[PDB]
Ligand binder design. Structure first.
Ligand SMILES: *[C@@H]1O[C@H](CO)[C@@H](O[C@@H]2O[C@H](CO)[C@@H](O[C@@H]3O[C@H](CO[C@H]4O[C@H](CO[C@H]5O[C@H](CO)[C@@H](O)[C@H](O)[C@@H]5O[C@H]5O[C@H](CO)[C@@H](O)[C@H](O)[C@@H]5O)[C@@H](O)[C@H](O[C@H]5O[C@H](CO)[C@@H](O)[C@H](O)[C@@H]5O[C@H]5O[C@H](CO)[C@@H](O)[C@H](O)[C@@H]5O)[C@@H]4O)[C@@H](O)[C@H](O[C@H]4O[C@H](CO)[C@@H](O)[C@H](O)[C@@H]4O[C@H]4O[C@H](CO)[C@@H](O)[C@H](O)[C@@H]4O[C@H]4O[C@H](CO)[C@@H](O)[C@H](O)[C@@H]4O)[C@@H]3O)[C@H](O)[C@H]2NC(C)=O)[C@H](O)[C@H]1NC(C)=O
Ligand SMILES: *[C@@H]1O[C@H](CO)[C@@H](O[C@@H]2O[C@H](CO)[C@@H](O[C@@H]3O[C@H](CO)[C@@H](O)[C@H](O)[C@@H]3O)[C@H](O)[C@H]2NC(C)=O)[C@H](O)[C@H]1NC(C)=O
Ligand SMILES: *[C@@H]1O[C@H](CO[C@H]2O[C@H](CO)[C@@H](O)[C@H](O)[C@@H]2O)[C@@H](O[C@@H]2O[C@H](CO)[C@@H](O)[C@H](O)[C@H]2NC(C)=O)[C@H](O)[C@H]1NC(C)=O
Ligand SMILES: CC(C)[C@H](C)[C@@H](O)[C@H](O)[C@@H](C)[C@H]1CC[C@H]2[C@@H]3CC(=O)[C@H]4C[C@H](O)[C@H](O)C[C@]4(C)[C@H]3CC[C@]12C
Ligand SMILES: *[C@@H]1O[C@H](CO)[C@@H](O[C@@H]2O[C@H](CO)[C@@H](O)[C@H](O)[C@H]2NC(C)=O)[C@H](O)[C@H]1NC(C)=O
Ligand SMILES: *[C@@H]1O[C@H](CO)[C@@H](O[C@@H]2O[C@H](CO)[C@@H](O)[C@H](O)[C@H]2NC(C)=O)[C@H](O)[C@H]1NC(C)=O
Ligand SMILES: *[C@@H]1O[C@H](CO)[C@@H](O[C@@H]2O[C@H](CO)[C@@H](O)[C@H](O)[C@H]2NC(C)=O)[C@H](O)[C@H]1NC(C)=O
Ligand SMILES: *[C@@H]1O[C@H](CO)[C@@H](O[C@@H]2O[C@H](CO)[C@@H](O)[C@H](O)[C@H]2NC(C)=O)[C@H](O)[C@H]1NC(C)=O
Ligand SMILES: *[C@@H]1O[C@H](CO)[C@@H](O[C@@H]2O[C@H](CO)[C@@H](O)[C@H](O)[C@H]2NC(C)=O)[C@H](O)[C@H]1NC(C)=O
Ligand SMILES: *[C@@H]1O[C@H](CO)[C@@H](O)[C@H](O)[C@H]1NC(C)=O
Ligand SMILES: *[C@@H]1O[C@H](CO)[C@@H](O)[C@H](O)[C@H]1NC(C)=O
Length: 720
């Protein structure tokens, strides 16, 4: 069994697909294989090779001298059981694969006594935790079981049963359970990084052994169900080296113990967000000269501690306090934080004016992100913000601002996200956008009082992902240059007074997936190029953004098919009381993060053109939109017939064609539409039988009413 042969064996009895030809030259000359001088294999590096196969580690460990095995970033599944061979690995990397049989972990823990670092992260390893590395293993230092599918309670001695040289143990990203106080860390020597984050571990007390981890640098216990008070008193003196602590998204309550400031000699990161903490950051925390990231969001904190305490922290660079009860005016002492790059105070009870002193710092300010959404700020957008040349994101939405958008905002060089919807801002969009100022990714100013037209200059914002200007007082034509924005994914211009034709150039927007021009004054014909991207849409950087969708539940009497709104830093409760939510008698609020449902070769997703004066026939190409979930062409002057191609709108759930002048029959293929949950073809001149398949026979009468001779259930039968 020569080493040269085993790899070829592995290549034939494992690899199922090599679309990149990563092994075409297949001992030492081969790709990924590193050799020693004596002519023995000691390393196999096949990371990110797009390999599809079935890994059985015993066929690689047969190699006598193999100590390095990199298979991370592939599509390897788990193979048969062990053929009983000897292991010599020191480094093993099986990350980002499709392993499922966790026996591969029991084998590496039983054998592989020279194992230094192992990583199974981002696989599908299932089952309960059981085996810890062999006691004969005297070198293992880092072990990463994170982001798998492990289950059930953790063994009481699991962590403690690790060799004494362990330094880094990552168990985050599974669904293990258990009262945390019953878990033993043992003497917990040499341990510096430990994470149980993102599991279902309960516990109202910490285990006593944890206090033995005197060398701990990162303690991450976030996204569990730990309850009670944060351990105070002298407890945090055990961790004289702790640099990062996270107790976020647990069930902790009470005040933040002043004794937690024992970590302030070395603490660099604290995340206590997502609990039910009250009071303020105790004054004792002034000694945190090393703290860089303070995240206390989604709690119930209040008081003046931003000024009494946080302003005294010099190394602060990332400050998060959104979703709290902090009232009053924003403190100006926060400018004494000279190294502050990101600041988030959204969803508090702030009053007064926008903070601006950050920019007139004796030096240039490094502030890049300023977020104060869902507060009660008033006045105008300070022109002083134009001095913060490092600014990239500005979120002032859902305040009570008024006045114009200063020229100095639109010329901030690095600006990227300009977000101030749900205010009373006036003025227009400069003709000098993205030319003298930053090339934006998001321009979200819906529900304001802006006026004028949309500058043709918008064509210069080639990085644009999301435009929202709905419910303003805009006029003019939609500039044809919009078609140059090939990264533009979302475009909302509803509830304005726009005139002209729908530009054919919209079809050049390669990534456009959401188009809302409803309730304007547009004329002309439906451009056929709006579907010219069906089956070609690539996903893009617009994904991963907080949104909320308010579904108007009032048929066609309610204008538009709902409301999609950017929702960073905003409370749902504040939306459910927005009068535009009362615009429809009945509503439901969906919320989440923007996420494509196709990896490539997609189509448009949302199209609302209702309440205009567009005329002509429905372009047949519109039936090709396979991922289209909404099509609202209602309330126009459309003529002709409903294309039978509409039978290929497999993803559609809402289809509004009412209050037009459509003739002919309903395509029978609509019956094949398995997600069609809301159809309205009433108030046309449609005729003939209603398609007998799908949900079309169960809809209310009002969805077919006022036509010229429709028949069939739910209408009277056509034969009488
Ligand atoms: C422990 O451990 C843990 C784990 O376990 C961790 O955690 C982590 O962390 C991290 C950090 O980073 C993160 O990541 C990140 O994130 C972000 C986002 O975030 C957000 O969100 C998320 C999500 O959420 C979700 O999920 C969850 C769970 O799963 C839940 O809970 C929720 O609810 C949700 O869910 C939802 O959704 C989903 C999806 O869709 C679905 O499915 C469901 O159903 C629903 O619907 C989260 O997670 C987060 O959280 C956070 O935060 C918060 C607030 O803050 C808090 O509370 C928490 O705790 C956390 O925290 C954190 O953070 C913070 C701040 O914030 C701090 O402070 C602390 O410390 C911590 O850390 C939130 O909410 C994003 O953004 C990202 O992404 C990024 O990155 C990546 C890589 O990694 C890439 O790829 C991408 O793209 C991006 O990037 C960016 O950035 C960069 C830089 O770096 C660059 O490069 C790029 O470009 C970008 O940029 C930007 O910008 C620019 C300009 O500048 C432009 O251009 C562009 O375009 C853009 O825009 C990431 O991913 C994660 O997430 C976490 N996880 C967890 C689990 O949590 C921690 O860390 C630890 N700790 C310690 C150690 O201490
Ligand atoms: C700290 O701030 C939070 C967040 O703003 C406050 O919680 C909110 O308090 C209002 C008070 O009316 C709650 O509204 C009530 O809720 C239910 C309907 O959900 C109903 O029983 C009442 O008619 C009323 O509308 C609101 O739901 C609540 N928000 C959340 C997310 O729980 C809190 O009151 C503030 N605390 C102090 C001491 O100021
Ligand atoms: C832009 O369009 C609005 C509204 O017109 C559309 O709706 C109204 C019904 O609301 C309907 O009458 C019209 O045919 C379109 O479907 C215009 O404002 C409306 O003007 C009509 C004129 O009869 C008045 O009866 C309405 O009260 C008035 N307002 C509303 C809310 O309807 C507006 O004039 C148009 N602007 C331009 C520049 O064309
Ligand atoms: C920008 C993209 C990525 C998106 C923001 C994406 O992330 C969202 O998931 C987006 C596609 C989701 C969020 C809200 C959804 C609608 C909510 C709703 O009330 C439903 C009622 C009924 O069930 C109908 O049949 C289908 C309806 C209309 C849904 C269509 C799909 C929507 C729009
Ligand atoms: C690991 O090597 C063993 C030993 O060659 C492989 O087991 C054989 O697989 C072939 C092909 O499927 C069968 O015909 C034999 O009956 C198997 N047993 C033997 C030879 O004793 C095994 O398939 C290899 N595993 C992987 C994942 O490559
Ligand atoms: C990764 O490999 C898995 C199998 O391990 C592939 O999943 C199969 O893909 C075929 C099409 O090639 C489907 O017919 C099967 O139903 C799939 N099986 C399972 C269990 O999902 C998967 O396509 C591969 N992914 C790649 C190469 O990106
Ligand atoms: C479109 O935007 C306008 C902006 O004025 C909204 O008009 C509001 O309508 C309500 C109806 O109850 C009035 O109470 C408000 O006073 C109006 N706003 C203002 C600023 O006067 C309208 O609701 C939006 N939606 C549509 C037309 O469907
Ligand atoms: C998915 O998109 C790809 C993009 O590559 C399409 O395939 C290529 O399209 C480009 C133009 O973008 C042509 O120059 C290539 O000749 C195409 N290659 C092919 C077809 O192999 C692909 O057609 C799209 N798929 C669907 C279902 O629309
Ligand atoms: C079908 O058309 C009739 C006639 O226009 C509609 O009845 C009108 O309803 C509006 C508001 O609902 C009233 O202001 C009118 O006075 C009504 N006219 C008559 C003659 O009664 C009816 O609502 C339409 N049906 C649907 C489902 O839209
Ligand atoms: C582990 O800790 C023990 C006792 O403190 C020490 O002797 C040993 O050298 C440490 N091992 C490593 C690899 O640091
Ligand atoms: C505009 O001002 C009025 C003043 O009464 C206020 O009620 C309204 O909420 C403001 N608009 C917003 C916050 O979008």
């Amino acid at each position: 069994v020569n080493d040269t042969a085993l790899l070829t064996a592995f290549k034939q009895t494992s690899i199922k697909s090599d679309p990149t030809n990563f092994l075409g030259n297949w001992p030492c000359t081969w790709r990924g294989v590193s050799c020693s001088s004596d002519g023995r294999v000691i390393g196999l590096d096949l990371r990110n090779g797009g390999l599809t196969g079935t890994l059985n580690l015993n066929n690689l460990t047969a190699l006598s001298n193999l100590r390095s095995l990199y298979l991370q970033g592939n599509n390897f599944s788990s193979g048969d059981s062990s053929s009983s061979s000897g292991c010599s690995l020191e480094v093993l990397d099986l990350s980002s694969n499709s392993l499922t049989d966790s026996s591969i972990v029991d084998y590496v823990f039983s054998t592989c006594l020279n194992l230094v670092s192992v990583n199974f992260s981002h696989n599908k390893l299932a089952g309960k935790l059981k085996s810890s590395p062999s006691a004969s293993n005297k070198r293992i230092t880092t072990v990463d079981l994170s982001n798998n599918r492990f289950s059930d309670e953790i063994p009481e001695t699991f962590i403690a049963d690790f060799p004494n040289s362990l330094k880094h143990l990552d168990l985050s990203g599974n669904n293990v359970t258990g009262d945390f106080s019953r878990l033993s860390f043992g003497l917990c020597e040499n341990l510096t990084v430990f994470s149980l984050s993102q599991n279902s571990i309960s516990g109202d007390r910490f285990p006593v052994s944890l206090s033995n981890c005197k060398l701990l640098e990162t303690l991450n216990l976030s996204r569990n169900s730990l309850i009670g008070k944060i351990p105070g008193d002298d407890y945090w003196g055990n961790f004289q080296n702790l640099r990062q602590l996270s107790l976020a998204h647990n069930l902790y309550s009470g005040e933040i113990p002043p004794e937690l400031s024992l970590l302030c000699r070395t603490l660099e990161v604290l995340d206590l967000s997502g609990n039910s903490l009250t009071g303020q950051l105790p004054q004792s925390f002034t000694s945190c000269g090393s703290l860089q990231s303070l995240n206390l969001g989604n709690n119930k904190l209040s008081g003046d501690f931003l000024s009494t305490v946080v302003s005294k922290l010099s190394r602060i660079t990332n400050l998060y306090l959104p979703f709290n009860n902090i009232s009053g005016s924003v403190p100006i002492s926060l400018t004494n934080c000279s190294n502050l790059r990101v600041l988030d105070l959204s969803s508090n009870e702030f009053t007064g004016e926008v903070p601006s002193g950050f920019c007139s710092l004796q030096s240039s300010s490094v502030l890049e992100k300023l977020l104060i959404a869902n507060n009660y700020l008033s006045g105008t957008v300070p022109v002083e913000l134009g001095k913060c040349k490092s600014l990239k994101t500005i979120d002032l939405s859902f305040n009570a601002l008024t006045g114009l958008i200063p020229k100095e905002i639109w010329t901030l060089p690095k600006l990227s996200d300009l977000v101030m919807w749900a205010n009373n801002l006036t003025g227009g969009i400069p003709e000098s956008i993205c030319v003298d100022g930053g090339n934006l990714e998001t321009l979200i100013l819906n529900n304001n009082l802006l006026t004028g037209s949309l500058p043709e200059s918008i064509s210069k914002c080639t990085n644009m992902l999301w435009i929202s200007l709905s419910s303003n007082l805009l006029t003019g034509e939609i500039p044809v240059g919009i078609g140059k924005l090939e990264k533009l994914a979302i475009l909302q211009l509803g509830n304005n007074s726009l005139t002209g034709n729908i530009p054919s150039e919209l079809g050049n927007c390669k990534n456009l997936i959401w188009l809302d021009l409803n309730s304007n004054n547009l004329t002309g014909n439906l451009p056929g190029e709006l579907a010219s991207q069906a089956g070609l849409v690539m996903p893009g950087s617009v994904s991963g953004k907080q949104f909320a969708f308010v579904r108007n539940e009032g048929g066609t009497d309610c204008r538009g098919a709902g409301g999609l709104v950017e929702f960073e830093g905003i409370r749902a409760e504040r939306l459910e009381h927005f009068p535009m939510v009362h615009s429809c008698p009945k509503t439901r609020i969906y919320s989440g993060m923007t996420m494509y449902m196709f990896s490539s070769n997609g189509s448009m997703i949302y199209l609302d053109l209702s309440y205009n004066a567009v005329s002509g026939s429905i372009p047949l190409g519109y039936g090709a939109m396979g991922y289209l979930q909404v099509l609202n062409l209602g309330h126009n002057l459309l003529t002709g017939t409903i294309p039978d191609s509409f039978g290929g709108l497999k993803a559609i759930g809402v289809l509004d064609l009412s209050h037009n002048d459509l003739q002919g029959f309903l395509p029978g293929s609509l019956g094949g539409l398995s997600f069609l949950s809301d159809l309205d073809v009433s108030n046309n001149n449609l005729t003939g039988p209603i398609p007998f398949g799908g949900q079309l026979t169960t809809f209310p009468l009002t969805r077919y009413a006022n036509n010229s001779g429709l028949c069939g259930v739910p209408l009277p039968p056509c034969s009488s």
